[model samples]
Structures are given as structure tokens and as C-alpha cells.
Target: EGYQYRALYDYKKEREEDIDLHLGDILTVNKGSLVALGFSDGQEARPEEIGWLNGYNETTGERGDFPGTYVEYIGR
Candidate 1:
């Protein structure tokens, strides 16, 4: 795991590629940059929105992109 973060709000997967999250969920960070995941369609996700994160959901056992704002930074 690269880092630790706790979900502040529930996040449901709107798209097929995105991951699902719930309130107070904990996940292990995989990649901090969404652009690095390379799932965007021509300029769909801009560079400025790089705050998004990719990780493995420990509770759900799912892995994919999620909004950074949904979670709060805890520690390494």
C-alpha cells in the first residue's frame, strides 16, 4: 500500500470503470494520479483533476478510480 485514506462520504460507481465506496470506508492507495490510469476519453478528465485517486477497496475487494474529495488523508 502506498498510503492510507478514509472515506468521508459514500461514493457509488456511476461509470463502469469507477469503483464504489461507502461512508467511513478504508482503502489502500494504488496510484494517486487518475491520468496515470489512462481510462479517459479525449480530455474527459483534465490534468487539473489529478487529485483523483486509484486504489483497492479493502472492504469491497474492488479496485478502480475514485474521487479524492470523498476520502480524507490518514497516514502511510
Candidate 2:
């Protein structure tokens, strides 16, 4: 599997113009979130495009910043 690939599910409940995943949909990713942080604290379904920002923070509330302390990937 030298060629890279990705799959995703849209968890958004509301219809967002940018966050374009729908109910029960399987999506293939062309970029971003190709590599995701392991399942641990503060991890998300995966990252893609802006998906890097789909997690929660206690102080900041809803934020979308990648490189979350709880999530780091380096062939991780």
C-alpha cells in the first residue's frame, strides 16, 4: 500500500456549507487527515481539510486547531 488513501465519515448534525459530510455517508479523502492521531484523549474521527479543528477544549470551548497536545502523529 505505498499509494496513500483515506476514508471518512461526516459527524456533523447540522448542514454546514464547508463541513460537507452527511448522515451515514462514507467519504474518501484526497488531502489532510490522511494521517491521524491515535485514539486516546481528545482524539477525533480523523482530520481532513479543516477537520483538524473538530475537537474540544475546556478553556477555549469549541476550537479548530491542529497539533492538539493530546493528538500528534508522526507515523503515529
Candidate 3:
């Protein structure tokens, strides 16, 4: 299962690993895709990863990581 989220601000991709987002764009995010930077240290989550997730951009049919801060959680 995944969660639904809406983009609150436009985000132009600056790198190959980022997803381009437009204001009001909706995307799907598998809960498992939430990025955690502390994979080696006690397998704990890191603060730097607080606003990052790998989501599916239906508009482009592309799956990439994005800044979660730009998107707001809408539904599950």
C-alpha cells in the first residue's frame, strides 16, 4: 500500500536522483520508500532524511526521490 500526497510548491529537478514536482501535483509514496540516512548506525533514522522519500510521479510515470517538505500528506 502507498500514501497519497500533494505538492505544495513547484520543484524543478536539479539532479538525476530528484523528481520534478509542480504545485498541486499528486504522487504516490510507498511507506517503505521513506529514506533513512542512518543505515549503518544502529539502523536508525537520521534527521537529514526527515523530508525525503522515494515516490512515484504519475504525471511522468517516473519513480525518484523527492523532498517531502514540498509535498503534504493527503491520504493513505
Top model by TM-score, which number? 3
lDDT of each: 0.65, 0.29, 0.65
Ranking by TM-score: 3, 1, 2
Output the worst ten-in-a-row residue range by lDDT, candidate 1: 41-50
Instruction: Give per-residue CA lDDT, model 2, range 1-76, as digits (tens).
Output: 1111122333333424223323333233222333354333323333332344332222223323332222322221
Model 2: lDDT equals 0.29
Q: Write the per-residue lDDT of candidate 3 for residues 1-76, one digit (tens) a residue.
A: 4566777788878777888888877778765555234334311133133567677778777777777778876665
TM-score of each: 0.67, 0.22, 0.70
Candidate 1 C-alpha error for residue 59, in Å: 0.9
Model 1 clashing-pair count: 0
Segments of candidate 3 deviating more than 4 angstroms: 35-49
